[PDB]
């Protein structure tokens, strides 16, 4: 859809069967979902923002679902203060900033 | 434009004869900008990134333009590593996330 920023962009993604709230972020290079068991193998991995960075872990080609969009690939876990869908999965779904 | 997300979307903002690089941001509800100086009052405000907060200074009703779009808000001013332009910013632009 054509979606707003009046309100952040929050939306429903499916991860291993879970239901989670994730903010659409253009100003995120990477995933980046609040603390969660997934399966494999993962690495260690630092990302940053204001404030400082947190270590998270990498999980790689993971599936998820965004607003009935199934994608997979790379996903970082870590003390994010909020699920964030960046960049590498925003491509996936084809979805652009208009204006 | 219909921006693509295949890279960082990085663009010219001009802010009282400066002329900067600043990335459109649907993760942020504000727009901060690195350090300068601004005419005018401003309140000591606390922003959180995913480190964790920082603070800024406030600074209302500045004009800034955006790939010659003419808007006019709050812009905080302090310690980012790149010039955010938020949600306050997109909206007055008309901008929308399209999938
Ligand atoms: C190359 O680095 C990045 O891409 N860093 C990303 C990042 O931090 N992006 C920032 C912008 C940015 C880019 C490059 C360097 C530094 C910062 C934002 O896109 C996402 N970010 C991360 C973030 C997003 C949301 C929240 C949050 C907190 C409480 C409730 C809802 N959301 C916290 C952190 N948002 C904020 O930090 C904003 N915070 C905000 O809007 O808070 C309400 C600010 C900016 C206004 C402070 C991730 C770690 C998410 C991948």
Redesign the interface.
Same mark, same amino acid.
């Not at 859809?1 to 009046?6: G, N, V």
């Not at 990302?47 to 947190?54: A, N, P, R, S, V």
């Not at 779904?93 to 204006?99: A, E, P, R, V, Y």
């Given at each position: 859809?054509?979606?707003?920023?009046?309100k952040?962009?929050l939306v429903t993604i499916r991860i291993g069967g879970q239901l989670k709230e994730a903010?659409?972020?253009?100003?995120?290079?990477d995933t980046?979902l609040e603390e969660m068991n997934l399966p494999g193998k993962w690495k260690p991995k630092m /990302? #940053?923002?204001?404030?400082? @960075?947190?270590k998270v872990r990498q999980y790689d080609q993971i599936p998820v679902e965004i607003?009935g969009?199934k994608v997979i690939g790379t996903v970082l876990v870590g003390p994010?203060?909020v699920n964030?869908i960046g960049?590498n999965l925003?491509?996936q /779904? #084809?979805?652009?900033?208009? @204006?």
């Open positions: 859809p054509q979606i707003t920023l009046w952040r962009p903010l659409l972020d253009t100003g995120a290079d980046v /990302i #940053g923002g204001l404030g400082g @960075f947190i607003c969009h994010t203060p964030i960049r925003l491509t /779904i #084809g979805c652009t900033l208009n @204006f």
